[PDB]
Amino acid sequence: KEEEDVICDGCNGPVVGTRYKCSVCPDYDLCSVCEGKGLHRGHTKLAFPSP
Ligand SMILES: [Zn+2]
Ligand SMILES: [Zn+2]
């Protein structure tokens, strides 16, 4: 199988639970830990679940 996984651009770890996808930068995502630490705060992100 091919699976589409989300990798955090802050820490390169898995994004499980809620994902924070940048609405400006292409193909850019933070995990909840990196989002809470304030990385990449200069752009609006979309917060939604991460199956
Ligand atoms: Zn992270
Ligand atoms: Zn961005």
Numbering used by the authors: -3 to 47
Lines from the paper:
Intriguingly, the autophagy adapter p62/SQSTM1/Sequestosome-1 was recently reported to recognize N-degrons, the N-end rule substrates of the well-characterized UPS, and where ultimately these substrates are delivered to ALS8,9. p62 is a key selective autophagy adapter that plays a role in the degradation of various cellular constituents such as misfolded proteins and their aggregates, malfunctioning organelles, and invading pathogens. Here, we present the high resolution structures of the ZZ-domain of p62 in complex with 8 different N-degrons including type-1 and type-2, and subsequently identify key determinants involved in the unusual recognition.
Therefore, we determined the structure of the ZZ-domain in complex with a variety of N-degrons comprising three type-1 N-degrons and five type-2 N-degrons. As described for the R-BiP complex, two aspartic acid residues, Asp129 and Asp149, bind to the α-amino group, and Asp147 forms a hydrogen bond with the first peptide bond, which means that these interactions are conserved in all different N-terminal residues. However, the side chain of the N-terminal residue of the N-degron is recognized differently. The side chain of Asn132 which undergoes a conformational change plays a critical role in interacting with the first residue of the N-degron. The bipolar nature of the side chain atoms (O and N) of Asn132 allow for the recognition of positively charged type-1 substrates as well as type-2 substrates, and especially N-terminal tyrosine and tryptophan residues since they possess polar atoms in the side chain.
